[PDB]
Amino acid sequence: MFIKPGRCPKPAVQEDFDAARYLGVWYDIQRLPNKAQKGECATATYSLSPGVGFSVFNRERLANGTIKSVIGSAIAEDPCEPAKLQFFHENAAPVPYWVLSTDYDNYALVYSCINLGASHAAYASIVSRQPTLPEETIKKLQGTMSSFGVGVDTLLTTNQDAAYCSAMN
Amino acid sequence: MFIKPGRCPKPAVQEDFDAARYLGVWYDIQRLPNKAQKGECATATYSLSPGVGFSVFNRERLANGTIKSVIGSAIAEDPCEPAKLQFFHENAAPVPYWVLSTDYDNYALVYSCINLGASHAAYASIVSRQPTLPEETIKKLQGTMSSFGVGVDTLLTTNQDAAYCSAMN
Amino acid sequence: MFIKPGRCPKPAVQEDFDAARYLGVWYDIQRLPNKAQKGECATATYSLSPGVGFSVFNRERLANGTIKSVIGSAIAEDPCEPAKLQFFHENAAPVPYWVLSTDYDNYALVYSCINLGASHAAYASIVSRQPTLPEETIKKLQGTMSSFGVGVDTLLTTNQDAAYCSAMN
Amino acid sequence: MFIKPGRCPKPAVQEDFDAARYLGVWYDIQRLPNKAQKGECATATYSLSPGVGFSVFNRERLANGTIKSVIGSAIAEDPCEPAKLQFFHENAAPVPYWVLSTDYDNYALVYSCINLGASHAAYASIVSRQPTLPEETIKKLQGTMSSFGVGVDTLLTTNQDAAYCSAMN
Ligand SMILES: C=CC1=C(C)/C(=C/c2[nH]c(/C=C3N=C(/C=C4\NC(=O)C(C)=C4C=C)C(C)=C\3CCC(=O)O)c(CCC(=O)O)c2C)NC1=O
Ligand SMILES: C=CC1=C(C)/C(=C/c2[nH]c(/C=C3N=C(/C=C4\NC(=O)C(C)=C4C=C)C(C)=C\3CCC(=O)O)c(CCC(=O)O)c2C)NC1=O
Ligand SMILES: C=CC1=C(C)/C(=C/c2[nH]c(/C=C3N=C(/C=C4\NC(=O)C(C)=C4C=C)C(C)=C\3CCC(=O)O)c(CCC(=O)O)c2C)NC1=O
Ligand SMILES: C=CC1=C(C)/C(=C/c2[nH]c(/C=C3N=C(/C=C4\NC(=O)C(C)=C4C=C)C(C)=C\3CCC(=O)O)c(CCC(=O)O)c2C)NC1=O
């Protein structure tokens, strides 16, 4: 997680968020530097859960070529705020996951923040239904992040090159 | 839940709790009065989840023969305390679910408490792998409950009569 | 607190809440039935704290003339939401305290809610800088309460009779 | 805060913790690297609160000679665990504060940890009633920290030199 001064911001989340349309495969396009993702080519796959919420399967390609994956569960603890989820990953304490913006069919912007006294730790990802996302969309989503304090100059661009990411089966 | 004086107790939980062995069908035998269950013949079915934790399917037989069911997800938010679960039901805020005692194949004692200032609200249930449980076991588990202040005078016996509950299957 | 169906509502809180102006003495005028206050003539006194937040001293007149008092501390855990406080009373778990509406010099409407699964427990109080409050103000504040589902049928009127409450001073 | 892999540990805390004997001045002797303390000569002063808990006044000498201070409130949210406090500092989100070990008259060992998914952020301090602490005591307290995972090789020694710290009025 990206540790910075100041308490967590509280950005607005996707109005009328429909988890049913959010399921499926999302490709990581840009992200803040964090501790969890040590590689490239990252995807998140969200699938139906027989309980509440949905289930999570994230995969990425490490620099050595190994595919690393993690499973988790996603739950909206307050059903009146379906876009404010809590993610429970194997071997991890709970972390928030807020869908800030999505059209379900092309892009989403997701954000997570944990307070650390007078500082905070945040995740943030622009994701796409395809390995790429149009630059106009990326710029708009960067606009949203800057509005609530995210230094978009620290954003990392995720490698989704078809050849490099062919290790992703 | 109904309200009793005092903050929540912190009873001991099942040592080395094994959620895989806890899965399957459990019959409600006795419980504290609460608002959630308005019927009889109650069962809880716990099943594999593709994410973390396990999935929840509770069923009961309402008085006009309807079978009311609720879905949920169960997660141990601290993996080092696997008997202290959080249950997320559709249309409910999160609630604790602590497995205080179980031999997995016959009985379990489950406890849930939420603080209300200087008072608290609790659920507590004796459950069985069969629609009945031996009086000796019931009495021992009531002893456990009384050791952290649960008045056994308040426990309701659930109707598990075979004829009455036949529509459950 | 006593239990009502539904999860907690999230009513709007006093904009630009100024805790310095909120300090001093407040008289209980009307409130939801609860377990905490068993007496009449109730007042809350809020005072400067050398740390953060402010200090709490509640007093009431018990039926056998005893003046029961409780001490506490009030803290706005998120400084950006100063009207959403947490109250820490001696011998109580933390409880929310939301200033929904106040003009500081005449009236305030305070609300506290804790989720109990699909149900909730709430406190709600109309308070005044005087032992009485005009009927017009009381009626407006009941309107606010009814807008987030508080049944005004349930509100108790607090005894603030001057003769009866004389031992308060 | 010191950000490291793994979830927070849960060390044992001081049995029978008596906040009344913990009040007064404590000198920082050794600490984990963190973001809050940017200087040396640090002291914490704990004083009586008219509410619950106690009030907090921390001071340190920056490298430029300026004295920097912060005020806060300390509260045991669960009165049955008086050694597990929550500290509310001005401009800061709440952070835990656990008194692991103290004899009140000479030393204390304090610990704070916040989970960050599969990682965590921790504070830890050895403090003394005097600007120094005997090496035998320091080694014992380092022994306690290593037992629950704290790499005592990362500990910083706080400058409490009488000349350098004379800026502390
Ligand atoms: C912004 C929200 C966000 C949250 C809440 C988050 C939490 C999070 N992601 C994790 C792993 C992971 N997270 C991802 C990828 C993603 N994870 C996502 O939420 C998204 C959108 C992607 C991109 C598709 C991968 C691939 C892993 C496994 C990393 C590995 O084990 O090598 C872990 C486990 C920590 C670990 O094992 O080291 C946590 C707690 N990561 C985030 O980016
Ligand atoms: C002791 C712990 C305990 C907890 C934490 C609990 C929580 C709980 N049970 C619920 C429903 C329910 N709970 C049950 C039955 C059970 N539920 C159980 O945890 C067990 C062991 C049984 C019995 C085998 C049933 C049948 C319902 C559906 C009731 C209804 O709304 O019609 C709900 C509301 C779901 C909703 O309608 O939104 C909650 C919050 N009940 C408990 O008894
Ligand atoms: C509406 C919000 C509200 C909250 C959050 C609340 C919480 C609350 N009030 C308490 C006591 C008390 N609360 C009051 C009176 C008041 N308390 C107030 O917040 C107000 C506005 C008044 C009236 C002016 C009194 C007199 C006591 C002591 C009651 C007793 O235990 O004898 C306690 C228990 C303290 C203890 O004995 O351990 C709690 C948890 N009461 C409320 O009414
Ligand atoms: C191990 C527990 C521990 C906790 C929970 C902790 C929290 C904490 N300490 C802070 C400041 C501070 N904390 C201290 C010193 C101390 N603070 C202490 O808890 C102790 C024992 C000392 C030593 C006497 C000082 C001097 C400051 C002010 C730093 C500054 O503003 O320059 C802040 C405010 C953050 C900021 O303004 O940047 C927090 C949240 N620090 C800790 O060391």
Could you write a compact summary of the structure shown?
Chain A is mostly beta strands. Chain A contains 2 helices and 10 strands. In chain A, a hairpin with a 2-residue loop joins strand 8 and strand 9 (119-128).
Count structural domains of chain A: 1
**How much of the sequence of chain A is in beta strands?**
35-45%
Structural class of chain A: mainly beta
Order of helices and strands of chain A: EHEEEEEEEEHE
Q: Largest inter-chain interface?
A: A-B, 24 and 24 residues
Biggest sheet of chain A, open or closed, and with what strands and sense?
Answer: 8 strands, antiparallel, barrel
Q: Given the structure, what is the number of helices of chain A?
A: 2
Q: Outline of chain A, from the CA principal axes?
A: globular
Helix content bin of chain A: 10-25%
Protein name (chains A, B, C, D): Apolipoprotein D
Pfam families (chains A, B, C, D): Lipocalin_2
Main location (chains A, B, C, D): secreted
Family (chains A, B, C, D): Belongs to the calycin superfamily. Lipocalin family.
